[PDB]
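Narrative progress, year one. The postdoctoral researcher (J.K.) led the effort to move from monomer predictions toward full complexes, under supervision of the PI. The following entry was the first complex the group processed end to end, covering 398 residues in total.
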Amino acid sequence: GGLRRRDLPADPLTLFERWLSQACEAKLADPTAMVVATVDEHGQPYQRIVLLKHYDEKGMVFYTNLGSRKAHQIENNPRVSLLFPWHTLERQVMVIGKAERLSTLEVMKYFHSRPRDSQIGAWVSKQSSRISARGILESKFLELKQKFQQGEVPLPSFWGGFRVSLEQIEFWQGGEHRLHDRFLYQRENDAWKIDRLAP
Amino acid sequence: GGLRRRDLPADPLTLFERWLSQACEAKLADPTAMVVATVDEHGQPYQRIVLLKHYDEKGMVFYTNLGSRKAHQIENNPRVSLLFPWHTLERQVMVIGKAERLSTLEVMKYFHSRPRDSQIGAWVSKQSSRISARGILESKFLELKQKFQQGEVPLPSFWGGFRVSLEQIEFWQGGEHRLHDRFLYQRENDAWKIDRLAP
Ligand SMILES: Cc1cc2nc3c(=O)[nH]c(=O)nc-3n(C[C@H](O)[C@H](O)[C@H](O)COP(=O)(O)O)c2cc1C
Ligand SMILES: Cc1cc2nc3c(=O)[nH]c(=O)nc-3n(C[C@H](O)[C@H](O)[C@H](O)COP(=O)(O)O)c2cc1C
């Protein structure tokens, strides 16, 4: 039935929650997978996929290695863009905001709530650095996989997370006659301003 | 069998061609769909999906409306990133380069080789501008769909294309034990330098 303004919820997260729910129901691979774009010191954008782990009015959260390229880029420029590649369902959601670091209390909590093999793998790689061979990863994994025995596997000091604020949330949905529906929610004065955008 | 350096082709496009071919064979929705990231005058990155239409050593090509936000952003900062969200196949390909405008000869050629209903739709929308109602699109479409009769449908002066140069091409492929394989090809002195990156 297309996407009409009169049917839009006041809070964009209500629409996002609905769409995310429908993506899970349609069994898309990694429905929480989103492409995060950051920008380096030279004005060059970079992209990579990460998984959305939690979200609310304060923003969308993902975890990563603090020595990674995306982390170094965010430290120099906190402005990021997030895009949910849901084109298989003829949809896209894009979020614009600032990335802020999570506290260790938050990171520890989430970290110890995930499968133990994932807790162990977080220790393995010096994410994004050049390495001379795959073997380096394999050896370290074997070492950690035994040195820990997985007693409770501690939080690496280089593991962290970012919360991206919700400054703008844009929805795209395939439309009849290829006349696609686009709505931009823009945070303005403690409220959301909504505008339809030409496709 | 994982991705080992000894098996990598000298030209990254050889690997890309192979992966793209396998994505089509696996019937992924829009295998040519890629997320293009651009940056505005304030250092804010923006993203949206577009379709890869052609590619060779000079770069990857997509078409769009010249009055769109991505076009305005490229005019101020030609640095872009392209990402193929092929995670359903446990893969990602990211391309870093500069976007350059295509000539009208090239644009006309491609434009007149695509279905006539798509040629007509290109005229409809003032892409990315705020519009007060969906009806604006519908009325214009009806008008154009009859004013043209589709005789041969002319090229809109505001329709164009960009070719993104190949400065860096990065491949990501899911690995055993979640130890993913990443290879970065970087254009250096008329050649490609290849490095494995930690996951
Ligand atoms: C489906 C999927 C989910 C991923 N999730 C994460 C994640 O949540 N955090 C992370 O650090 N990397 C994740 N990655 C790997 C990133 O895409 C990227 O390879 C890595 O974070 C290093 O990026 P960087 O070098 O730009 O910093 C994921 C990859 C795929 C394909
Ligand atoms: C699968 C898919 C393919 C698309 N292909 C194109 C394209 O090739 N060119 C284009 O201008 N927009 C395309 N779009 C629409 C863009 O994502 C975006 O809505 C539009 O270009 C305006 O972006 P901008 O406002 O950032 O400039 C596509 C959307 C989807 C979901």
